[PDB]
Amino acid sequence: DLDLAKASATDQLKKAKAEAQVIIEQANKRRSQILDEAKAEAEQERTKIVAQ
Amino acid sequence: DLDLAKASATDQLKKAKAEAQVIIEQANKRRSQILDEAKAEAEQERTKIVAQ
C-alpha cells in the first residue's frame, strides 16, 4: 500500500502538472492567433475605408 | 493516498481550464478595443479628407 501510494501520487500529480501547463500554453497560442487576426483585420478595415 | 492524488490532479486540470478561458476572454476584450480604435481613426481621417 505504501509503495502504490508513492507511485500513484507521483503519477497523478506529475501528469496533471504537465497537462495543465500545456493547455495554458495552448491558450496562449489561441491568444496570439486572436490578437494577430484582430490586428490584420483592423488594418484591412482601415485600408478599405480609406480606399472607399 | 489515492483519494488525495485523484483530487489534486483533477482540480489542477480544472484550474487550467478556467485559466485558459479567462486568457481567451482577455484576448476578446483586447480585440474589441483595438478594432474600435481602428474604426474611430479611419472615420476621423475620412471625414476630414472629404471636407478638404
mmCIF file with all atom_site columns, C-alpha atoms in Angstrom:
data_model
loop_
_atom_site.group_PDB
_atom_site.id
_atom_site.type_symbol
_atom_site.label_atom_id
_atom_site.label_alt_id
_atom_site.label_comp_id
_atom_site.label_asym_id
_atom_site.label_entity_id
_atom_site.label_seq_id
_atom_site.pdbx_PDB_ins_code
_atom_site.Cartn_x
_atom_site.Cartn_y
_atom_site.Cartn_z
_atom_site.occupancy
_atom_site.B_iso_or_equiv
_atom_site.pdbx_formal_charge
_atom_site.auth_seq_id
_atom_site.auth_comp_id
_atom_site.auth_asym_id
_atom_site.auth_atom_id
_atom_site.pdbx_PDB_model_num
ATOM 1   C CA . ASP A 1 1  ? 0.000   0.000  0.000   1.00 0.00 ? 1  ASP A CA 1
ATOM 2   C CA . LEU A 1 2  ? 2.765   2.484  0.801   1.00 0.00 ? 2  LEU A CA 1
ATOM 3   C CA . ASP A 1 3  ? 4.595   1.648  -2.448  1.00 0.00 ? 3  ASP A CA 1
ATOM 4   C CA . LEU A 1 4  ? 1.481   2.077  -4.585  1.00 0.00 ? 4  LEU A CA 1
ATOM 5   C CA . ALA A 1 5  ? 0.745   5.277  -2.653  1.00 0.00 ? 5  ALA A CA 1
ATOM 6   C CA . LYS A 1 6  ? 4.116   6.726  -3.690  1.00 0.00 ? 6  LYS A CA 1
ATOM 7   C CA . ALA A 1 7  ? 3.717   5.535  -7.283  1.00 0.00 ? 7  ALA A CA 1
ATOM 8   C CA . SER A 1 8  ? 0.137   6.786  -7.742  1.00 0.00 ? 8  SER A CA 1
ATOM 9   C CA . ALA A 1 9  ? 0.743   10.129 -6.015  1.00 0.00 ? 9  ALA A CA 1
ATOM 10  C CA . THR A 1 10 ? 3.750   10.915 -8.208  1.00 0.00 ? 10 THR A CA 1
ATOM 11  C CA . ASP A 1 11 ? 1.998   9.651  -11.351 1.00 0.00 ? 11 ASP A CA 1
ATOM 12  C CA . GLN A 1 12 ? -1.195  11.654 -10.807 1.00 0.00 ? 12 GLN A CA 1
ATOM 13  C CA . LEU A 1 13 ? 0.485   14.882 -9.722  1.00 0.00 ? 13 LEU A CA 1
ATOM 14  C CA . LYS A 1 14 ? 3.179   14.979 -12.406 1.00 0.00 ? 14 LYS A CA 1
ATOM 15  C CA . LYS A 1 15 ? 0.786   14.030 -15.239 1.00 0.00 ? 15 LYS A CA 1
ATOM 16  C CA . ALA A 1 16 ? -1.737  16.721 -14.295 1.00 0.00 ? 16 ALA A CA 1
ATOM 17  C CA . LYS A 1 17 ? 1.098   19.210 -13.678 1.00 0.00 ? 17 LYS A CA 1
ATOM 18  C CA . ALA A 1 18 ? 2.207   18.632 -17.273 1.00 0.00 ? 18 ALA A CA 1
ATOM 19  C CA . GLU A 1 19 ? -1.206  18.769 -18.986 1.00 0.00 ? 19 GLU A CA 1
ATOM 20  C CA . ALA A 1 20 ? -2.338  21.906 -17.134 1.00 0.00 ? 20 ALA A CA 1
ATOM 21  C CA . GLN A 1 21 ? 0.671   23.966 -18.233 1.00 0.00 ? 21 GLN A CA 1
ATOM 22  C CA . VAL A 1 22 ? 0.407   22.529 -21.748 1.00 0.00 ? 22 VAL A CA 1
ATOM 23  C CA . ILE A 1 23 ? -3.235  23.624 -22.050 1.00 0.00 ? 23 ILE A CA 1
ATOM 24  C CA . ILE A 1 24 ? -2.321  27.069 -20.718 1.00 0.00 ? 24 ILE A CA 1
ATOM 25  C CA . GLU A 1 25 ? 0.292   27.473 -23.459 1.00 0.00 ? 25 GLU A CA 1
ATOM 26  C CA . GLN A 1 26 ? -2.278  26.217 -25.983 1.00 0.00 ? 26 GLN A CA 1
ATOM 27  C CA . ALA A 1 27 ? -4.494  29.033 -24.725 1.00 0.00 ? 27 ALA A CA 1
ATOM 28  C CA . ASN A 1 28 ? -1.594  31.394 -25.406 1.00 0.00 ? 28 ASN A CA 1
ATOM 29  C CA . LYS A 1 29 ? -1.417  30.034 -28.960 1.00 0.00 ? 29 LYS A CA 1
ATOM 30  C CA . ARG A 1 30 ? -5.108  30.884 -29.351 1.00 0.00 ? 30 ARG A CA 1
ATOM 31  C CA . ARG A 1 31 ? -4.403  34.274 -27.727 1.00 0.00 ? 31 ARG A CA 1
ATOM 32  C CA . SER A 1 32 ? -1.696  35.094 -30.285 1.00 0.00 ? 32 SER A CA 1
ATOM 33  C CA . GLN A 1 33 ? -3.954  33.802 -33.082 1.00 0.00 ? 33 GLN A CA 1
ATOM 34  C CA . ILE A 1 34 ? -6.814  36.075 -31.988 1.00 0.00 ? 34 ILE A CA 1
ATOM 35  C CA . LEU A 1 35 ? -4.612  39.126 -31.383 1.00 0.00 ? 35 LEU A CA 1
ATOM 36  C CA . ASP A 1 36 ? -2.860  38.907 -34.754 1.00 0.00 ? 36 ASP A CA 1
ATOM 37  C CA . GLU A 1 37 ? -6.170  38.262 -36.533 1.00 0.00 ? 37 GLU A CA 1
ATOM 38  C CA . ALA A 1 38 ? -7.622  41.365 -34.865 1.00 0.00 ? 38 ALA A CA 1
ATOM 39  C CA . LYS A 1 39 ? -4.570  43.396 -35.922 1.00 0.00 ? 39 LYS A CA 1
ATOM 40  C CA . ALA A 1 40 ? -4.708  42.166 -39.530 1.00 0.00 ? 40 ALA A CA 1
ATOM 41  C CA . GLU A 1 41 ? -8.431  42.830 -39.905 1.00 0.00 ? 41 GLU A CA 1
ATOM 42  C CA . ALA A 1 42 ? -8.148  46.221 -38.192 1.00 0.00 ? 42 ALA A CA 1
ATOM 43  C CA . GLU A 1 43 ? -5.622  47.377 -40.768 1.00 0.00 ? 43 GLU A CA 1
ATOM 44  C CA . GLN A 1 44 ? -7.608  45.779 -43.611 1.00 0.00 ? 44 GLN A CA 1
ATOM 45  C CA . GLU A 1 45 ? -10.635 47.708 -42.300 1.00 0.00 ? 45 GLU A CA 1
ATOM 46  C CA . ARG A 1 46 ? -8.669  50.976 -42.266 1.00 0.00 ? 46 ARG A CA 1
ATOM 47  C CA . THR A 1 47 ? -7.336  50.409 -45.787 1.00 0.00 ? 47 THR A CA 1
ATOM 48  C CA . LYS A 1 48 ? -10.794 49.563 -47.130 1.00 0.00 ? 48 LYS A CA 1
ATOM 49  C CA . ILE A 1 49 ? -12.345 52.642 -45.506 1.00 0.00 ? 49 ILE A CA 1
ATOM 50  C CA . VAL A 1 50 ? -9.714  54.973 -46.991 1.00 0.00 ? 50 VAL A CA 1
ATOM 51  C CA . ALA A 1 51 ? -9.982  53.297 -50.414 1.00 0.00 ? 51 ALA A CA 1
ATOM 52  C CA . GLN A 1 52 ? -13.745 53.815 -50.134 1.00 0.00 ? 52 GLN A CA 1
ATOM 53  C CA . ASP B 1 1  ? -3.447  8.367  -0.652  1.00 0.00 ? 1  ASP B CA 1
ATOM 54  C CA . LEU B 1 2  ? -5.253  7.636  -3.928  1.00 0.00 ? 2  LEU B CA 1
ATOM 55  C CA . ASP B 1 3  ? -8.098  9.941  -2.879  1.00 0.00 ? 3  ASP B CA 1
ATOM 56  C CA . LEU B 1 4  ? -5.624  12.819 -2.446  1.00 0.00 ? 4  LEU B CA 1
ATOM 57  C CA . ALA B 1 5  ? -3.801  12.101 -5.711  1.00 0.00 ? 5  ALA B CA 1
ATOM 58  C CA . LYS B 1 6  ? -7.014  11.907 -7.766  1.00 0.00 ? 6  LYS B CA 1
ATOM 59  C CA . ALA B 1 7  ? -8.447  15.073 -6.204  1.00 0.00 ? 7  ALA B CA 1
ATOM 60  C CA . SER B 1 8  ? -5.275  17.147 -6.658  1.00 0.00 ? 8  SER B CA 1
ATOM 61  C CA . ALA B 1 9  ? -4.797  16.082 -10.287 1.00 0.00 ? 9  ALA B CA 1
ATOM 62  C CA . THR B 1 10 ? -8.403  16.782 -11.277 1.00 0.00 ? 10 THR B CA 1
ATOM 63  C CA . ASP B 1 11 ? -8.560  20.174 -9.544  1.00 0.00 ? 11 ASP B CA 1
ATOM 64  C CA . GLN B 1 12 ? -5.278  21.122 -11.223 1.00 0.00 ? 12 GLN B CA 1
ATOM 65  C CA . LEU B 1 13 ? -6.925  20.305 -14.559 1.00 0.00 ? 13 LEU B CA 1
ATOM 66  C CA . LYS B 1 14 ? -9.956  22.413 -13.585 1.00 0.00 ? 14 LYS B CA 1
ATOM 67  C CA . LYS B 1 15 ? -7.655  25.334 -12.731 1.00 0.00 ? 15 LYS B CA 1
ATOM 68  C CA . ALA B 1 16 ? -6.048  25.024 -16.160 1.00 0.00 ? 16 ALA B CA 1
ATOM 69  C CA . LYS B 1 17 ? -9.419  25.072 -17.941 1.00 0.00 ? 17 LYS B CA 1
ATOM 70  C CA . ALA B 1 18 ? -10.602 28.171 -16.055 1.00 0.00 ? 18 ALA B CA 1
ATOM 71  C CA . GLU B 1 19 ? -7.298  29.981 -16.657 1.00 0.00 ? 19 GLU B CA 1
ATOM 72  C CA . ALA B 1 20 ? -7.380  29.191 -20.389 1.00 0.00 ? 20 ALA B CA 1
ATOM 73  C CA . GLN B 1 21 ? -10.952 30.502 -20.635 1.00 0.00 ? 21 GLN B CA 1
ATOM 74  C CA . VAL B 1 22 ? -10.117 33.814 -18.952 1.00 0.00 ? 22 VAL B CA 1
ATOM 75  C CA . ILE B 1 23 ? -6.968  34.126 -21.095 1.00 0.00 ? 23 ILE B CA 1
ATOM 76  C CA . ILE B 1 24 ? -9.165  33.866 -24.191 1.00 0.00 ? 24 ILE B CA 1
ATOM 77  C CA . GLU B 1 25 ? -11.696 36.354 -22.788 1.00 0.00 ? 25 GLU B CA 1
ATOM 78  C CA . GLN B 1 26 ? -8.901  38.873 -22.188 1.00 0.00 ? 26 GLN B CA 1
ATOM 79  C CA . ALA B 1 27 ? -7.941  38.345 -25.828 1.00 0.00 ? 27 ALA B CA 1
ATOM 80  C CA . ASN B 1 28 ? -11.554 39.001 -26.891 1.00 0.00 ? 28 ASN B CA 1
ATOM 81  C CA . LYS B 1 29 ? -11.786 42.258 -24.936 1.00 0.00 ? 29 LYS B CA 1
ATOM 82  C CA . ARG B 1 30 ? -8.450  43.376 -26.418 1.00 0.00 ? 30 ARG B CA 1
ATOM 83  C CA . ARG B 1 31 ? -9.883  42.525 -29.859 1.00 0.00 ? 31 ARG B CA 1
ATOM 84  C CA . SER B 1 32 ? -12.834 44.855 -29.268 1.00 0.00 ? 32 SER B CA 1
ATOM 85  C CA . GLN B 1 33 ? -10.540 47.639 -28.041 1.00 0.00 ? 33 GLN B CA 1
ATOM 86  C CA . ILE B 1 34 ? -8.129  47.590 -30.982 1.00 0.00 ? 34 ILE B CA 1
ATOM 87  C CA . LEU B 1 35 ? -10.910 47.219 -33.572 1.00 0.00 ? 35 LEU B CA 1
ATOM 88  C CA . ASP B 1 36 ? -12.860 50.194 -32.217 1.00 0.00 ? 36 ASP B CA 1
ATOM 89  C CA . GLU B 1 37 ? -9.658  52.269 -32.155 1.00 0.00 ? 37 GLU B CA 1
ATOM 90  C CA . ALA B 1 38 ? -9.084  51.462 -35.831 1.00 0.00 ? 38 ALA B CA 1
ATOM 91  C CA . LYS B 1 39 ? -12.709 52.301 -36.677 1.00 0.00 ? 39 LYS B CA 1
ATOM 92  C CA . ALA B 1 40 ? -12.521 55.682 -34.922 1.00 0.00 ? 40 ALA B CA 1
ATOM 93  C CA . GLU B 1 41 ? -9.214  56.636 -36.565 1.00 0.00 ? 41 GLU B CA 1
ATOM 94  C CA . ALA B 1 42 ? -10.488 55.674 -40.026 1.00 0.00 ? 42 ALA B CA 1
ATOM 95  C CA . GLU B 1 43 ? -13.723 57.651 -39.638 1.00 0.00 ? 43 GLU B CA 1
ATOM 96  C CA . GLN B 1 44 ? -11.808 60.734 -38.442 1.00 0.00 ? 44 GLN B CA 1
ATOM 97  C CA . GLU B 1 45 ? -9.453  60.560 -41.447 1.00 0.00 ? 45 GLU B CA 1
ATOM 98  C CA . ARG B 1 46 ? -12.297 60.050 -43.930 1.00 0.00 ? 46 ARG B CA 1
ATOM 99  C CA . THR B 1 47 ? -14.401 62.962 -42.681 1.00 0.00 ? 47 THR B CA 1
ATOM 100 C CA . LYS B 1 48 ? -11.513 65.420 -42.777 1.00 0.00 ? 48 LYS B CA 1
ATOM 101 C CA . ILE B 1 49 ? -10.375 64.389 -46.276 1.00 0.00 ? 49 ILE B CA 1
ATOM 102 C CA . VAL B 1 50 ? -13.877 64.708 -47.741 1.00 0.00 ? 50 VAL B CA 1
ATOM 103 C CA . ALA B 1 51 ? -14.336 68.219 -46.312 1.00 0.00 ? 51 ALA B CA 1
ATOM 104 C CA . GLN B 1 52 ? -10.944 69.259 -47.720 1.00 0.00 ? 52 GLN B CA 1
#
